[PDB]
PDB file of C-alpha atoms and ligand atoms in Angstrom:
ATOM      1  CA  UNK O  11     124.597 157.309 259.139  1.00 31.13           C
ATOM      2  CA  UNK O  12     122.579 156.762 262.196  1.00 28.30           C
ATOM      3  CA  UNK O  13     122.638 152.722 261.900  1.00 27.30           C
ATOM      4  CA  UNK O  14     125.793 152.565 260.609  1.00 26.40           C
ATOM      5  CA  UNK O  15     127.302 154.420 263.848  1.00 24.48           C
ATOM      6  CA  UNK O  16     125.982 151.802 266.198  1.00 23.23           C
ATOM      7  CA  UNK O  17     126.402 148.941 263.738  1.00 24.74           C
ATOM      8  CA  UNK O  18     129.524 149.805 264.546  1.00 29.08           C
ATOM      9  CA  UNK O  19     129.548 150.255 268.459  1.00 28.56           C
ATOM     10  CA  UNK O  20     127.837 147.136 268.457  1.00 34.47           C
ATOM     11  CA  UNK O  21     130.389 145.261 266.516  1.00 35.25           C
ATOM     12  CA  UNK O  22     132.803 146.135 269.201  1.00 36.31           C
ATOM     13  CA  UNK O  23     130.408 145.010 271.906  1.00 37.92           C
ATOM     14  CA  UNK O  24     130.437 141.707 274.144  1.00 39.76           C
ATOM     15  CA  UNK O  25     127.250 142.134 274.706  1.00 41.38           C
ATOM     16  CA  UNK O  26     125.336 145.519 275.258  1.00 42.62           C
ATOM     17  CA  UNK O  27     122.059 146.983 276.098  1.00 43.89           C
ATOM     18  CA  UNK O  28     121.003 150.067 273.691  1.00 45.47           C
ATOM     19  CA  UNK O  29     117.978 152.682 274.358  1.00 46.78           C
ATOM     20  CA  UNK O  30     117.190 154.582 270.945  1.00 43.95           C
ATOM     21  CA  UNK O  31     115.690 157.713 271.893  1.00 46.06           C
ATOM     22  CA  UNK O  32     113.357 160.188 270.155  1.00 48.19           C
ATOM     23  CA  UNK O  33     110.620 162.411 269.894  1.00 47.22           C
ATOM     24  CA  UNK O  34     109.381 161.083 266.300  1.00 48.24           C
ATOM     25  CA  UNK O  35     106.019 158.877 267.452  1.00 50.31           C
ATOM     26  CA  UNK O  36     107.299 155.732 265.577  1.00 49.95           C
ATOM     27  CA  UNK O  37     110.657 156.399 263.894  1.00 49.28           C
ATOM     28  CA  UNK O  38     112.355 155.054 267.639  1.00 47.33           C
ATOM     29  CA  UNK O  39     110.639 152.059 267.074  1.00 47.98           C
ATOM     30  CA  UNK O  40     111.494 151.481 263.182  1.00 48.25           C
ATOM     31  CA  UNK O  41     115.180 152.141 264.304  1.00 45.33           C
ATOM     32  CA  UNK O  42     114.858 149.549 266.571  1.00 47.64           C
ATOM     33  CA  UNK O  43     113.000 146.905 264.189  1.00 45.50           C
ATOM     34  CA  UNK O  44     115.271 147.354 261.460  1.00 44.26           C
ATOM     35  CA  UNK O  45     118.899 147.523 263.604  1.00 45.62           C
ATOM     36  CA  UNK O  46     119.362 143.522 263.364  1.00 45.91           C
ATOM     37  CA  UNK O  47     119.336 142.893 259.764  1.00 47.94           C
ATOM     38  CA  UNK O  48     121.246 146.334 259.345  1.00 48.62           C
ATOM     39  CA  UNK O  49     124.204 144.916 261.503  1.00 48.43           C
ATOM     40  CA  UNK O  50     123.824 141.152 260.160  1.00 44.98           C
ATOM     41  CA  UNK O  51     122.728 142.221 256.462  1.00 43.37           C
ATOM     42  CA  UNK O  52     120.469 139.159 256.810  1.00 42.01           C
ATOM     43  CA  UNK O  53     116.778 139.348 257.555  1.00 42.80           C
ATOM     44  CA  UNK O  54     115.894 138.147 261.100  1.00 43.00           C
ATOM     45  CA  UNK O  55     114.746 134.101 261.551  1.00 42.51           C
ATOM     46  CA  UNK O  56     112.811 133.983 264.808  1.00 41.04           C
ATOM     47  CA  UNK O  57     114.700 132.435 266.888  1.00 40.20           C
ATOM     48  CA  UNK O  58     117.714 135.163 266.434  1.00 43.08           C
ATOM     49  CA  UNK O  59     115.205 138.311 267.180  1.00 40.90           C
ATOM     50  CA  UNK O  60     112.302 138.305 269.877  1.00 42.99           C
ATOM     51  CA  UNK O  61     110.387 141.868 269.972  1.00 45.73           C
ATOM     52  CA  UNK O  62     108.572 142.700 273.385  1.00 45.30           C
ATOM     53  CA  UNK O  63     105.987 144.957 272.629  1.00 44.72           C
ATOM     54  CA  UNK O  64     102.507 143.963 274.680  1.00 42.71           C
ATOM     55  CA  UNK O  65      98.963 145.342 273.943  1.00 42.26           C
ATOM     56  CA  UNK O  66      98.402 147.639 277.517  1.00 42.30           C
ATOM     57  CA  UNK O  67     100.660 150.202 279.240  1.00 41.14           C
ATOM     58  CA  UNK O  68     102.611 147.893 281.581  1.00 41.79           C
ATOM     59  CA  UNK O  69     105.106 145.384 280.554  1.00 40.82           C
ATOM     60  CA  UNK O  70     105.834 143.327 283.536  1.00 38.86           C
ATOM     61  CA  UNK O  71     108.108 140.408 285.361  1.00 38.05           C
ATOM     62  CA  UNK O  72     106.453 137.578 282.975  1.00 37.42           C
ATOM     63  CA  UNK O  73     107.994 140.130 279.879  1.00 37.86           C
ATOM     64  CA  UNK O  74     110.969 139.671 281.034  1.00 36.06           C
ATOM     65  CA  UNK O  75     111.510 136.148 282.402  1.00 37.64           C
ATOM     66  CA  UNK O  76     110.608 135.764 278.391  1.00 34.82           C
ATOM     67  CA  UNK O  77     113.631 137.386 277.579  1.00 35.42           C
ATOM     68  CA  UNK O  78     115.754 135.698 279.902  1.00 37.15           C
ATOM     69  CA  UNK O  79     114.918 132.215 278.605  1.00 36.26           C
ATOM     70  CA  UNK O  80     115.271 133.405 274.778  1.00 39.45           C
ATOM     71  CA  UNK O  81     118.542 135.261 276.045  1.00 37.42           C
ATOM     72  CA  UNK O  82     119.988 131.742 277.405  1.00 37.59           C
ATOM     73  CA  UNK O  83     120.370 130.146 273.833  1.00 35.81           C
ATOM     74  CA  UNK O  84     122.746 131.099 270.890  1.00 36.14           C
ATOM     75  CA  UNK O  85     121.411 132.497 267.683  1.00 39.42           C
ATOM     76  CA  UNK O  86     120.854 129.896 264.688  1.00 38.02           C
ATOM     77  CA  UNK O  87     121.827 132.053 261.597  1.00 38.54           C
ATOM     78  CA  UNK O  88     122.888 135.712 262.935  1.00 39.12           C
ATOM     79  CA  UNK O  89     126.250 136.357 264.833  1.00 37.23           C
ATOM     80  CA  UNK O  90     124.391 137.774 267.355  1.00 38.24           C
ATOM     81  CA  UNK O  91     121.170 137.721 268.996  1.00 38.67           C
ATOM     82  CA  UNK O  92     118.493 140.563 269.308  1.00 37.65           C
ATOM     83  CA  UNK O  93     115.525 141.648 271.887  1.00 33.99           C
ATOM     84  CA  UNK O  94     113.727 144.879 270.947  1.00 33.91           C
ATOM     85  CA  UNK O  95     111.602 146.141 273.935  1.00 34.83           C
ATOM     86  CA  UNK O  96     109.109 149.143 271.838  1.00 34.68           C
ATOM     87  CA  UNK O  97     108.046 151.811 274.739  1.00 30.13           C
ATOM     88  CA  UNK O  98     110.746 150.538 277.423  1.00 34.00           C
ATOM     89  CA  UNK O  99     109.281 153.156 280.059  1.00 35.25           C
ATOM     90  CA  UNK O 100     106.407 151.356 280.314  1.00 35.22           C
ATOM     91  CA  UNK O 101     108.052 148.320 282.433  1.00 34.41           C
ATOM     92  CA  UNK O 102     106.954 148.057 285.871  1.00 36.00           C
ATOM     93  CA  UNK O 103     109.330 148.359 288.820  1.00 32.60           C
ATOM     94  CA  UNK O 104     109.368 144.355 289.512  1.00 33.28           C
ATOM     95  CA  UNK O 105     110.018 143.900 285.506  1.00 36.35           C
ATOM     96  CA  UNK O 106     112.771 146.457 285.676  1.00 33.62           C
ATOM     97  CA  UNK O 107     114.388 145.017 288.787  1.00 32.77           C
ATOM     98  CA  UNK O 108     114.431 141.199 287.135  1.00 31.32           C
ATOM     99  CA  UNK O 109     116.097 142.780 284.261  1.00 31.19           C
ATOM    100  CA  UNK O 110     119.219 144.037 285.652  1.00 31.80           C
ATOM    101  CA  UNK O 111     121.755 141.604 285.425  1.00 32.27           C
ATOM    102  CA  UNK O 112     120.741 140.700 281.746  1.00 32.80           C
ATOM    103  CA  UNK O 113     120.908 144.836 280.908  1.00 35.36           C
ATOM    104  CA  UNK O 114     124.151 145.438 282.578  1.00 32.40           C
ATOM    105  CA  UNK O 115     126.040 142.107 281.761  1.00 32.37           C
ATOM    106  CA  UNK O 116     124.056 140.772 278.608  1.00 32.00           C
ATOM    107  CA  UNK O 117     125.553 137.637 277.177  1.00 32.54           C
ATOM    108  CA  UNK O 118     128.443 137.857 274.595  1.00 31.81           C
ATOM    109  CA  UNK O 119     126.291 136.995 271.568  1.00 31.52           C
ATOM    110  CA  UNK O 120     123.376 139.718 273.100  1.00 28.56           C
ATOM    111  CA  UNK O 121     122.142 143.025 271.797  1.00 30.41           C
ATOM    112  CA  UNK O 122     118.989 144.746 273.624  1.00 33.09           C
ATOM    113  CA  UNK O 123     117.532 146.905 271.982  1.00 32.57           C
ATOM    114  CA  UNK O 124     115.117 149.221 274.155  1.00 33.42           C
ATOM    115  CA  UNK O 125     113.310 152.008 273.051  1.00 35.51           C
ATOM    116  CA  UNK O 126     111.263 155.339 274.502  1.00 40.11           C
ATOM    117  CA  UNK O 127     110.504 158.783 274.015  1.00 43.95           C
ATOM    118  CA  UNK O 128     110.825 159.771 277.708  1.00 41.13           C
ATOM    119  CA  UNK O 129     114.600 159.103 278.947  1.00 39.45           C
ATOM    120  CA  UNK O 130     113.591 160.093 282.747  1.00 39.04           C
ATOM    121  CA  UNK O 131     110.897 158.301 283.067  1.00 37.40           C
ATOM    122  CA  UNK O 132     113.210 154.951 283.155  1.00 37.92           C
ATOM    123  CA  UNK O 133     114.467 154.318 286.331  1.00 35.73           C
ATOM    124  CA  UNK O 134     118.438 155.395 287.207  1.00 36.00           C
ATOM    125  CA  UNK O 135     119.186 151.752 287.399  1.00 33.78           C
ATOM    126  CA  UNK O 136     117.779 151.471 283.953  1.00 32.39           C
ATOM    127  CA  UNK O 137     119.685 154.412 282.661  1.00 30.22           C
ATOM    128  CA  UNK O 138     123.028 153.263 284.341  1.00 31.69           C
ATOM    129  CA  UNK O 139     122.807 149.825 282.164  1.00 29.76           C
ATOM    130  CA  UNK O 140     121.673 151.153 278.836  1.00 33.68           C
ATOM    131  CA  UNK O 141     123.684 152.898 276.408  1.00 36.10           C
ATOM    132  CA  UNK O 142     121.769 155.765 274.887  1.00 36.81           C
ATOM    133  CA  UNK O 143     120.861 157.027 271.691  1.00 35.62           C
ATOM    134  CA  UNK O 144     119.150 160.058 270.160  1.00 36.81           C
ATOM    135  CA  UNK O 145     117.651 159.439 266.589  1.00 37.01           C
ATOM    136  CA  UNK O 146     116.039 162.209 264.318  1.00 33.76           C
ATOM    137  CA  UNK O 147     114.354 161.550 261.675  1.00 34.09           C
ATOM    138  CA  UNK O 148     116.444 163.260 259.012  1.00 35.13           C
ATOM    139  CA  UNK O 149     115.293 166.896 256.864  1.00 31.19           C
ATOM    140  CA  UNK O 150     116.099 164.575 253.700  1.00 32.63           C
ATOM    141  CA  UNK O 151     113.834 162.047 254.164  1.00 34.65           C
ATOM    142  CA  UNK O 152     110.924 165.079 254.987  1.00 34.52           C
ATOM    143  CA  UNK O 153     112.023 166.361 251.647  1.00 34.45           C
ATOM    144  CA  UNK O 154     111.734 163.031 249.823  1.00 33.70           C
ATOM    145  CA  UNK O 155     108.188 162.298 251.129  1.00 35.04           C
ATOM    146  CA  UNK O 156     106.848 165.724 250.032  1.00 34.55           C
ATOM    147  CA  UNK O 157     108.267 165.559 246.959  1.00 36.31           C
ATOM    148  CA  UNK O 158     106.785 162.065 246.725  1.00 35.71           C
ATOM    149  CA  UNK O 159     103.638 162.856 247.746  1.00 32.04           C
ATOM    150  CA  UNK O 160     103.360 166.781 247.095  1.00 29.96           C
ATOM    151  CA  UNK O 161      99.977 169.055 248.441  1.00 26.66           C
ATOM    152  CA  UNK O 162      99.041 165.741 250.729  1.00 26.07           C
ATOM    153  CA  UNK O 163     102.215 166.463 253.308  1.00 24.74           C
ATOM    154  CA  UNK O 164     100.408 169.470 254.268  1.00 27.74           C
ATOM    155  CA  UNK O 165      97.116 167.825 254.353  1.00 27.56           C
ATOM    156  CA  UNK O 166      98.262 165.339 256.468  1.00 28.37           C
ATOM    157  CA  UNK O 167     100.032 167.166 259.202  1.00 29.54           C
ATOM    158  CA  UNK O 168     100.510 163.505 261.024  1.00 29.71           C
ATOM    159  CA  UNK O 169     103.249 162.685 258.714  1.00 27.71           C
ATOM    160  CA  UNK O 170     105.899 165.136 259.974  1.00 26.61           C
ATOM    161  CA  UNK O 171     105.868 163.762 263.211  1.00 27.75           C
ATOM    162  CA  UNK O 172     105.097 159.351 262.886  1.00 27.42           C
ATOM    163  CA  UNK O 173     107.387 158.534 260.976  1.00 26.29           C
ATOM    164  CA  UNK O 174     105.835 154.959 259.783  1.00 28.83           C
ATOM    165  CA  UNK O 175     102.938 156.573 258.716  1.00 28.02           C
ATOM    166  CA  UNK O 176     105.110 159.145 256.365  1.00 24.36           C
ATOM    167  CA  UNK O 177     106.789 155.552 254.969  1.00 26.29           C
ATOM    168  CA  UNK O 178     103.579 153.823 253.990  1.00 26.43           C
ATOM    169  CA  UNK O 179     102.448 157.314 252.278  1.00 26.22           C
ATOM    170  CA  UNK O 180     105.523 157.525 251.114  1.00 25.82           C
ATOM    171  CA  UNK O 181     105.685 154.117 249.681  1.00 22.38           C
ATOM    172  CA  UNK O 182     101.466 154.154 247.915  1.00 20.30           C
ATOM    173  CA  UNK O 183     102.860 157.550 246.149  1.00 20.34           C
ATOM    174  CA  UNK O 184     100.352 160.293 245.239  1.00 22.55           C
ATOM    175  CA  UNK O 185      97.985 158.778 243.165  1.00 20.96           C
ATOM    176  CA  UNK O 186      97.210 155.792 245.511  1.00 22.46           C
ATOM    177  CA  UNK O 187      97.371 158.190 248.389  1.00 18.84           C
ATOM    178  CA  UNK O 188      94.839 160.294 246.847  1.00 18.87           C
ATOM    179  CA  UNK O 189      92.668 157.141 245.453  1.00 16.52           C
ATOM    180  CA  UNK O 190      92.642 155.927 249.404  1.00 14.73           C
ATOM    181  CA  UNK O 191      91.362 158.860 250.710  1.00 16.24           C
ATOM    182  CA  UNK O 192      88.465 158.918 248.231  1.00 14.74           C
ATOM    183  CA  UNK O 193      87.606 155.275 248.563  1.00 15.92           C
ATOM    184  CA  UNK O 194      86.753 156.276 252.542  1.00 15.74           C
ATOM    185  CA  UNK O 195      85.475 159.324 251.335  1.00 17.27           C
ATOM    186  CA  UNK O 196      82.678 156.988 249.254  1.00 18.32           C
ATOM    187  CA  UNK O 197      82.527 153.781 251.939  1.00 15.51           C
ATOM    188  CA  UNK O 198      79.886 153.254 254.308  1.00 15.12           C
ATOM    189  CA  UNK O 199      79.790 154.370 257.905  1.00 11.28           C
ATOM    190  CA  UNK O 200      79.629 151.046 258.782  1.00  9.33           C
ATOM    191  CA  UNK O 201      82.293 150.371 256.961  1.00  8.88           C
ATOM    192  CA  UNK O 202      84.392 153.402 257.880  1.00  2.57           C
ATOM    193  CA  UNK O 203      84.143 152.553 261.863  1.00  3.02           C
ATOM    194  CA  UNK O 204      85.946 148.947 261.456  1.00  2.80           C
ATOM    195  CA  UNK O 205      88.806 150.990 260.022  1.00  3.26           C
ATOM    196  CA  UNK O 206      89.115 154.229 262.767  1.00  4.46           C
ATOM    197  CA  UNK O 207      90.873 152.021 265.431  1.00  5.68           C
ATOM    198  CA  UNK O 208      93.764 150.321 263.020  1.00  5.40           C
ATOM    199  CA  UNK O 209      97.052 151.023 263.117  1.00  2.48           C
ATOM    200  CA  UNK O 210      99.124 153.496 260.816  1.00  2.00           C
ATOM    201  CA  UNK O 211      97.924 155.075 257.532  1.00  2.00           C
ATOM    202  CA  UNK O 212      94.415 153.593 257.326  1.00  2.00           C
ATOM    203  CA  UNK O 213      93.321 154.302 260.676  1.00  2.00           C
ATOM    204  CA  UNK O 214      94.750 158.541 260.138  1.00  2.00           C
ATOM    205  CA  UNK O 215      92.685 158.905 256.949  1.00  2.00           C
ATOM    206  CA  UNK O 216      89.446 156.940 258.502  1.00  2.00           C
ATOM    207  CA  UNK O 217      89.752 159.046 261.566  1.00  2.00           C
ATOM    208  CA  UNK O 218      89.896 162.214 259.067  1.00  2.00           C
ATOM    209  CA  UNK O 219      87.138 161.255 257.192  1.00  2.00           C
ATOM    210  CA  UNK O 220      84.868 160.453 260.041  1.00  2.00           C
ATOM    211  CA  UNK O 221      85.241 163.863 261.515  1.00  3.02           C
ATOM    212  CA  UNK O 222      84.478 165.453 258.467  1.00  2.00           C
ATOM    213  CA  UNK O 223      81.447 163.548 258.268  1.00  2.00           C
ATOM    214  CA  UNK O 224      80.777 164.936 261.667  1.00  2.00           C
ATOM    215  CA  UNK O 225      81.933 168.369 260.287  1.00  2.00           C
ATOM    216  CA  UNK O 226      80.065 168.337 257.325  1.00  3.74           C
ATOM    217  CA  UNK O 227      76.545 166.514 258.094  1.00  3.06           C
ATOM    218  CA  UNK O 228      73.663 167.838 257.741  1.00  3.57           C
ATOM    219  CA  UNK O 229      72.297 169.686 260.870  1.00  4.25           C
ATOM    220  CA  UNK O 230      69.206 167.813 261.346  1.00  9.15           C
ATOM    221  CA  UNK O 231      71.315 164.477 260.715  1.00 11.48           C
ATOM    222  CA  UNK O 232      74.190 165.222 263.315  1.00  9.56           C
ATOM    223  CA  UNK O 233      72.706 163.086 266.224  1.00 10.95           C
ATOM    224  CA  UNK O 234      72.233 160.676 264.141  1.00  8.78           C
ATOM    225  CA  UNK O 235      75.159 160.188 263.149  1.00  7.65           C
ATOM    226  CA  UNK O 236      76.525 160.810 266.777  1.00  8.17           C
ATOM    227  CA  UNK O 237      74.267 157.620 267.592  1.00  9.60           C
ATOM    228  CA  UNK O 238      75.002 155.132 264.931  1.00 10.06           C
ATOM    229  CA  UNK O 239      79.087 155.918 266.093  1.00 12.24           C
ATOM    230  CA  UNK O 240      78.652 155.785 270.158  1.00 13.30           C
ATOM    231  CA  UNK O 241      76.203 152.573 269.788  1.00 16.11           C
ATOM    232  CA  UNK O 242      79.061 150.897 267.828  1.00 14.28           C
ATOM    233  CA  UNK O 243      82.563 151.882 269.026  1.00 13.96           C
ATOM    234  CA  UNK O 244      82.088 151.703 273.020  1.00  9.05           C
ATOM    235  CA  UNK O 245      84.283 151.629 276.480  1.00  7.80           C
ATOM    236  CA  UNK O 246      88.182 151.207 275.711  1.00  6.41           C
ATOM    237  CA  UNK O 247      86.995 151.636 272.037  1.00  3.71           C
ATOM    238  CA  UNK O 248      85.864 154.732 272.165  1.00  2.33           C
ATOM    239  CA  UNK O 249      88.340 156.208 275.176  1.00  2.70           C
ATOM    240  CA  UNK O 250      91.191 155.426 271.978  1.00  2.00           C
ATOM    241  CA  UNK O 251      88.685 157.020 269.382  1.00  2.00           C
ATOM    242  CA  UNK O 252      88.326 160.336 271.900  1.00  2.00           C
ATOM    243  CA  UNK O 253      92.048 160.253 272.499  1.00  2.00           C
ATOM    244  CA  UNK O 254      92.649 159.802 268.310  1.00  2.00           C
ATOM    245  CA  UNK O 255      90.389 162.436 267.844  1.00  2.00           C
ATOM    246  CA  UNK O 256      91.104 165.000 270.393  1.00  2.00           C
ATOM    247  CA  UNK O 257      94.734 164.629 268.629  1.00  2.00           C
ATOM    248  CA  UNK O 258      93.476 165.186 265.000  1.00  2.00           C
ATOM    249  CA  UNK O 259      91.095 168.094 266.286  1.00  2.00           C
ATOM    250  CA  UNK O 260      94.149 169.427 268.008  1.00  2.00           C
ATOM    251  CA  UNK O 261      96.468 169.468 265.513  1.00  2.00           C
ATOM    252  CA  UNK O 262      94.510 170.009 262.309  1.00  2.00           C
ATOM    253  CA  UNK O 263      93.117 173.404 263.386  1.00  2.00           C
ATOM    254  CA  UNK O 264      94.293 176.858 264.391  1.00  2.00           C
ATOM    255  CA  UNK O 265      93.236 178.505 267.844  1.00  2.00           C
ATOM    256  CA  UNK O 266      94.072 182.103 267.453  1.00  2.00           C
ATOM    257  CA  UNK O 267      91.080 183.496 269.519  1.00  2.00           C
ATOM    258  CA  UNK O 268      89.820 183.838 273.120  1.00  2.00           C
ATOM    259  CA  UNK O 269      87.212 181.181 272.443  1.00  2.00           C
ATOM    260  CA  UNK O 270      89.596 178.985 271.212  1.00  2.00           C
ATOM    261  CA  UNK O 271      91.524 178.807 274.312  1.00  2.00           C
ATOM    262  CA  UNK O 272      88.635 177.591 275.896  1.00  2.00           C
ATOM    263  CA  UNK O 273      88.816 174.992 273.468  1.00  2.00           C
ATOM    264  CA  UNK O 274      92.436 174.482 273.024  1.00  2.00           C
ATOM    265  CA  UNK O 275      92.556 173.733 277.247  1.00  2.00           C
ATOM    266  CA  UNK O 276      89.873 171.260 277.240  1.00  2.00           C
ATOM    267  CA  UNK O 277      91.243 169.064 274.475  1.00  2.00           C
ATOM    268  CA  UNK O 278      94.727 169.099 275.607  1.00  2.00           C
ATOM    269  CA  UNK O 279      92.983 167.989 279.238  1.00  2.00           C
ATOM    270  CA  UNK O 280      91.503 165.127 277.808  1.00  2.00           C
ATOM    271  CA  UNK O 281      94.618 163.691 276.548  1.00  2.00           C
ATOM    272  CA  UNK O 282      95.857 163.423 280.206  1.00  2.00           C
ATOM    273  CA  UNK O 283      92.584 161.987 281.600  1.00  2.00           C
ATOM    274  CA  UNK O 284      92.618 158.259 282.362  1.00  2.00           C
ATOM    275  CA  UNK O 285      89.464 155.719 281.159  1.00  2.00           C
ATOM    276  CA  UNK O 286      87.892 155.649 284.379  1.00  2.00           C
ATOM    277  CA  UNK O 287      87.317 159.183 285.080  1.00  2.00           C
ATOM    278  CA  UNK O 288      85.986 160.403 281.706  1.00  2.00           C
ATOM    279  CA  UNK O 289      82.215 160.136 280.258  1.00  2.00           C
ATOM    280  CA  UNK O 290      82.878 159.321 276.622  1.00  2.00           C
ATOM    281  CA  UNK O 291      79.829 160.118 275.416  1.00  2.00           C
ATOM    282  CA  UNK O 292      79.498 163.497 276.683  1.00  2.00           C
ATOM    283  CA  UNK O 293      83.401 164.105 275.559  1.00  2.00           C
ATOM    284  CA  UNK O 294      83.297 162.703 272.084  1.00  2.00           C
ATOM    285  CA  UNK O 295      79.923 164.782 271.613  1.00  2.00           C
ATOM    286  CA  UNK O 296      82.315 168.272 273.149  1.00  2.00           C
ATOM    287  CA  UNK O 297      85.055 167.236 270.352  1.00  2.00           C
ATOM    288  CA  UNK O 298      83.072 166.892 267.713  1.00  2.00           C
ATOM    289  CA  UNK O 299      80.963 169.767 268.303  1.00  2.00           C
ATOM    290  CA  UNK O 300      84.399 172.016 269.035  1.00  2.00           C
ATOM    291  CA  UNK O 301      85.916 170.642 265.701  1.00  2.00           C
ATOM    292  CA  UNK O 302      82.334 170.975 263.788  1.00  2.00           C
ATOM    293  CA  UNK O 303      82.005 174.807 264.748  1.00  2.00           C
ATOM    294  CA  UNK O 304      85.519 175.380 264.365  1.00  2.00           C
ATOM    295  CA  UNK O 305      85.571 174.412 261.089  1.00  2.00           C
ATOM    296  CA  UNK O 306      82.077 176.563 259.891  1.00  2.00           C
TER     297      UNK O 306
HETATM  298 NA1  LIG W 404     114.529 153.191 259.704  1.00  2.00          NA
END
């Protein structure tokens, strides 16, 4: 419904710049990702699709002079040719400047695809170019995935809101689902802490099972633990595992009580704290203990 509506806007198009806009952590993205073979019913070569996404928060004026040069050229196999920009709001305002002319008179044969989760944060000259679009992810698909999946949707409270996460649980089914989360369950700390920082799925259920490690551990071993983590994951490593954590913490508890606002207000500060102002050490130790009490 969704892709078929601008499938068709896009048909009609000589050339236009879309935002796809949503609150879903991911399912902006995947919208984005899987528009060009939607509208060309062709997978994308290459040379027809060019995705912008970079590792940091800032994409810049280098971003998109890259555009501009794969803009120049015709696409090989597809009718028309594709840029996806992931996390748009994130261009600086040199990069958004650069990238007027392109947004607001793209060539014929040009689609841009930009997406975000924050429509005012893009500047007006941004939002004058750019037609938008909300996307929801859809109560059916919700209802497919449980059904997939059963008791694990509410054991993995992630799912409802990333929506490439709920695919790749989605797509293992129960049984592997439930076979994943014991084979962390069993691995080696060691192990385990090479898998906290990846992307999607794995990552969720290794960040879950570390903190019930931490949760569970013996007393006397807590430290310990604590150690053999902070001496391994360190600096921008372990400002992403706080910020992972303080999320799972978060939102895989209840805080009913007066002590618990305490609680609540210092994790939700730390999500808003940038890397150079935080002690990770001391805050990873706060977390853990928080989430560790919390659940005894
Ligand atoms: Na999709």
């Amino acid at each position: 419904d969704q892709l078929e509506t601008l499938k068709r806007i896009i048909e009609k198009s000589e050339g236009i710049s879309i935002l796809i806009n949503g609150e879903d952590l991911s399912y902006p993205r995947e919208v984005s990702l899987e528009l060009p073979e939607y509208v060309e019913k062709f997978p994308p070569k290459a040379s027809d699709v060019l995705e912008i996404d970079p590792e940091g928060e800032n994409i810049g004026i280098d971003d998109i002079r890259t555009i501009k040069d794969f803009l120049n050229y015709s696409p090989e196999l597809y009718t028309r040719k594709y840029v996806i920009v992931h996390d748009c709001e994130r261009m600086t305002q040199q990069a958004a400047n650069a990238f007027l002319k392109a947004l607001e008179e793209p060539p014929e044969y040009a689609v841009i695809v930009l997406n975000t989760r924050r429509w005012h944060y893009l500047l007006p000259t941004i939002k004058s170019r750019v037609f938008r679009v909300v996307v929801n992810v859809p109560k059916e698909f919700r209802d497919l995935v449980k059904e997939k999946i059963g008791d694990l949707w509410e054991e993995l409270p992630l799912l409802e809101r990333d929506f490439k996460t709920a695919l790749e649980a989605y797509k293992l089914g129960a049984e592997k689902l439930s076979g994943l989360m014991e084979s962390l369950k069993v691995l080696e700390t060691e192990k385990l802490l090479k898998k906290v920082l990846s992307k999607g799925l794995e990552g969720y259920l290794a960040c879950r099972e570390l903190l019930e490690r931490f949760s569970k551990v013996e007393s006397k071993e807590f430290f310990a633990l604590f150690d053999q983590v902070t001496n391994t994951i360190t600096g921008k490593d372990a400002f992403l595992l706080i910020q992972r954590l303080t999320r799972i913490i978060l939102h895989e508890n209840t805080w009913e009580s007066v002590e618990d606002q305490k609680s609540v207000s210092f994790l939700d500060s730390i999500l808003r704290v940038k890397i150079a102002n935080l002690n990770n050490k001391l805050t990873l130790m706060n977390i853990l203990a928080i989430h560790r009490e919390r659940k005894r």
